[PDB]
């Protein structure tokens, strides 16, 4: 594996640092590394593909080496080189792709393809170098074992979930109390509604709560917390819990009272914020708990008083809400986020080559399904597959 990596930074730091004119010296340490490779190769043969609409190409080697004591590289030098690189390019592509679809369960964390199973071989280790590509940097540390980790923008930790829970309801659905929410990606919006505007509630206050359990711990999270859930601030006709009928939601929004956000880790409060809107830091957590209340306004102008009668029908439904967005965070496990193309690369290669559904990943590499049941096997396969996608993107985008 680590093998694979090199094969690339080799070419990039190559197809990049080797141009018409450059003084020699800044490549001496480079040329060398390069050649070393060629040697190890030439002689051994390779097999690529064999599944679905995946071509089956064969490969051989025997390419001259490279000059040493020159000075300034003449055009002629380049072309006689680019022609030798373009075989490795078109190669690696066919290599990544081949091991970017195979999956195993017992040991689906390691190499699979007849291409790679031969790379982990010992006579090959003669290449590994310059491991500064964020992903490999993390692959290794995981191998030896330790505080791994990655960087994500608007991470994708919440499987899509859009639903409601009626804590008080009746057939006519004319006096409900409960919550409705949308958990998706890095965002949570939750609203608590009470058709009665806490008219008969103790202290004229109705308590609400929304708990979200992450499938993986997030550390060093920068989070935006804002009052109100715009998504649940408009009139809706919704299906009943049993699907037998539809109810009407006609919200009027009040400020959430006694807002308390807790970021817990294994049941323990790690961070807690009381009514603090704006930017907050949650340093280590696997659960978010949002508690907020609807408090019936003790003083109301006529226009307001008119919305909240002492008796039904309740036509304006008091609603309070919160919006929470994880802008950035670190996770010890790979995840999809709003900036990295890994998930899209893996999903795209599989779709383009009509790769059959396997035993590990959900059909279509569906993110919601994947994160909902993020088993150790799916994570090991995902990491292997994401690391390969990142190696590929150094050369082919």
């Amino acid at each position: 594996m680590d093998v694979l990596y090199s094969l690339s930074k080799t070419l990039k730091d190559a197809r990049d640092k080797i141009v018409e004119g450059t003084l020699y010296s800044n490549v001496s340490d480079l040329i060398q590394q390069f050649n070393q490779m060629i040697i190890t190769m030439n002689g051994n043969e390779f097999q690529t593909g064999g599944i679905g609409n995946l071509p089956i190409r064969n490969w051989n080697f025997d390419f001259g080496l490279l000059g040493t004591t020159l000075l300034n590289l003449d055009a002629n030098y380049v072309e006689t080189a680019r022609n030798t690189i373009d075989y490795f390019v078109d190669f690696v592509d066919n290599v990544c792709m081949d091991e970017m679809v195979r999956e195993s369960q017992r040991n689906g964390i390691a190499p699979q393809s007849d291409s790679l199973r031969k790379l982990s071989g010992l006579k090959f280790k003669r290449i590994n170098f310059d491991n500064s590509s964020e992903y490999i940097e993390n692959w290794n540390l995981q191998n030896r074992r330790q505080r791994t980790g990655f960087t994500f923008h608007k991470p994708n930790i919440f499987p899509y979930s859009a639903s409601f829970t009626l804590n008080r309801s009746q057939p006519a659905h004319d006096n409900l109390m409960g919550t409705m929410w949308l958990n998706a990606g890095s965002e949570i919006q939750v609203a608590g509604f009470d058709y009665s505007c806490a008219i008969n509630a103790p202290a004229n206050t109705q308590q609400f709560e929304h708990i979200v359990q992450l499938r993986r711990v997030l550390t060093t999270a920068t989070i935006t917390l804002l009052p109100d859930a715009e998504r649940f601030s408009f009139p809706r006709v919704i299906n009943s819990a049993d699907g037998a009928t539809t109810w009407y939601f006609n919200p009027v929004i009040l400020r959430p009272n006694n807002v308390e956000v807790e970021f817990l880790l294994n049941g323990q409060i790690i961070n807690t914020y009381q009514a603090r809107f704006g930017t907050i830091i949650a340093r280590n957590f696997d659960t978010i708990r949002l508690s907020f209340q609807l408090m019936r306004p003790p003083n109301m102008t006529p226009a307001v008083a008119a919305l909240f009668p002492n008796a039904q029908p309740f036509e304006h439904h008091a609603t309070v809400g919160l919006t929470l967005r994880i802008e950035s965070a670190v996770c010890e496990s790979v995840l999809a986020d709003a900036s990295e193309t890994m998930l899209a690369n893996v999903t795209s290669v599989r779709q383009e080559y009509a790769i059959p559904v396997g035993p590990v990943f959900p059909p279509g590499m569906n993110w919601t399904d994947l994160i909902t049941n993020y088993s150790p096997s799916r994570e090991d396969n995902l990491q292997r597959v994401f690391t390969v996608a990142s190696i590929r993107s150094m050369l082919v985008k």
Binding site: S28, N35, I39, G67, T69, L70
Partner: protein, 98 residues
């Protein structure tokens, strides 16, 4: 101490190499591939056409090959046959080392 079967060459390919696939002491092992290579890297077109087969900057002054040629030697001091042997042998080797 390795292949006490001394060897057996008829005429395969690069009788000097082949040893790499079957030698357990990396130091020893690099020598082999490097020596079985350094093909006099026959590829040069300088100062306006000049096919003048060059060779490793490595060799050049980066020299180390030497340092490695030695380090590999620094760990060859062991048994097998009469004593008047290793004694005489390794002693010579050291004279290369110093």
């Amino acid at each position: 101490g390795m292949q006490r079967m001394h060897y057996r060459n008829g005429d395969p390919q690069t009788p000097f190499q082949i040893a790499e696939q079957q030698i357990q002491n990396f130091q020893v092992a690099n020598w082999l591939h490097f020596v079985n290579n350094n093909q006099f890297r026959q590829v040069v077109i300088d100062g306006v056409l000049n096919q003048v087969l060059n060779d490793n900057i490595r060799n050049g002054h980066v020299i180390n090959q030497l340092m490695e040629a030695l380090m590999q030697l620094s760990r060859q001091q062991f048994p097998t046959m009469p004593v008047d042997y290793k004694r005489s042998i390794q002693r010579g080797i050291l004279l290369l080392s110093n």
